[PDB]
Amino acid sequence: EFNVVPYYSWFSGITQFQKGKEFEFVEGQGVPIAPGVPATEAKGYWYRHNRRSFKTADGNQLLPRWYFYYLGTGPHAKDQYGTDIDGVYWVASNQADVNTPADIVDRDPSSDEAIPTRFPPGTVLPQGYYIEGS
Numbered sequence: 001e002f003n004v005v006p007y008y009s010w011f012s013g014i015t016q017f018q019k020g021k022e023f024e025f026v027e028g029q030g031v032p033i034a035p036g037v038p039a040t041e042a043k044g045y046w047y048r049h050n051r052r053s054f055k056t057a058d059g060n061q062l063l064p065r066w067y068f069y070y071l072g073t074g075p076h077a078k079d080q081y082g083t084d085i086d087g088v089y090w091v092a093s094n095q096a097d098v099n100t101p102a103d104i105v106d107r108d109p110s111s112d113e114a115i116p117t118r119f120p121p122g123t124v125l126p127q128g129y130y131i132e133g134s
């Protein structure tokens, strides 16, 4: 959850469940599927949301959840594709030109719900992460 309204992602998140497992995709992979989006526009980044949990008197544990943003949108809309940034993982179809922003409008209000994150057959899924909505 967010105490500052976030940029809304078109897709559900990917939640870490095993610590020590790295968030990664094979180059050319990792752009979630949206109906009718052309492969030339399939370019962007996953953004890590670090979560925090209040102290109790039990065991006293919350793992990061990542959200996808098309290139030129979201909290890292101005950063160059492939630039080394903590918490940002760039992904793009081999059909995409990562020099130009995706021609994709942002999501919300009550106009559209988040698309459950899906990847095409052949996609190497990052071990230790759970895809929300799966």
Ligand SMILES: O=C1C(Cl)=C(NCCN2CCOCC2)C(=O)c2ncccc21
Residues within 6 Å of the ligand: 001, 002, 006, 007, 008, 009, 012, 067, 112, 113, 114
């Ligand atoms: O801020 C988070 C929560 Cl609070 C938003 N609330 C709505 C929950 N989803 C939106 C549509 O239906 C699936 C879940 C989510 O839309 C989501 N937006 C992208 C990054 C952060 C998250």
